[PDB]
C-alpha cells in the first residue's frame, strides 16, 4: 500500500499533475496544493514543497491544532487519495 505513491499514480495516469488539484479541509480551514509531475505537493499559501500527502497534511493540521500528531484527509478533485490508491491495486 505504502509502495503506491503519487509518483506511481501519475506514471500509470490514475492522477494528472496540475495547480490547486489537491485540497485538505480541517476544523474550518481549507488548504490547496499543486501536484507536480515528480509527485511532490506545493502548498499554494506559502509555496512550501512537501514530499508526500502525509507530510503536507501533518504540517497543515498542526497549524490549526498543534496537538494533532494523509491519504484519508487529502482529496484530488473532490475524491480522497485513498480511493485512487485502492483503484491502482484493483487495476494492478
Author numbering: 62 to 130, 134 to 156
Manuscript excerpt for this entry:
Recent research has identified the Mpr1/Pad1 N-terminal (MPN) domain-containing protein (MPND) as a sensor protein that may recognize DNA 6mA modification in eukaryotes. Moreover, the Mpr1/Pad1 N-terminal (MPN) domain-containing protein (MPND) was the first reported protein containing the RAMA domain to directly bind to DNA with the 6mA modification in vitro. In this work, we investigated the first crystal structures of the apo–MPND and the MPND–DNA complex from Mus musculus at the atomic resolution. Our results revealed that MPND possesses multiple functions, such as binding DNA and interacting with histones.
After extensive crystallization trials and optimizations, we successfully obtained MPND (residues 2–160) crystals suitable for diffraction experiments. The final apo–MPND structure in the space group P212121 was refined to 2.06 Å resolution, with an Rwork of 23.0% and an Rfree of 24.9%. In the final structural model, the asymmetric unit contained two protein protomers, each with three helices (α1–α3), two long antiparallel β-strands (β1–β2), and four short β-strands (β3–β6). Each protomer included MPND residues 62–156 with missing residues (131–133). According to the SDS-PAGE of crystals, the key reason the N-terminal structure could not be resolved was due to the conformational flexibility during crystallization rather than due to protein degradation. The two protomers possessed virtually identical spatial arrangements, as revealed by structural superposition, with an overall root-mean-square deviation (RMSD) of 1.0 Å for all Cα atoms. The main structural differences between the two protein protomers were in the irregular loops, particularly in the N-terminal location. Two MPND molecules were present in the asymmetric unit of the apo–MPND structure, but their interaction was weak. Interestingly, the structural analysis suggested two possible dimer configurations: dimer 1, which possessed an interface area of 439 Å2; and dimer 2, which was generated from the symmetry and possessed an interface area of 411 Å2. Therefore, the oligomeric state of apo–MPND in the solution is mainly monomeric.
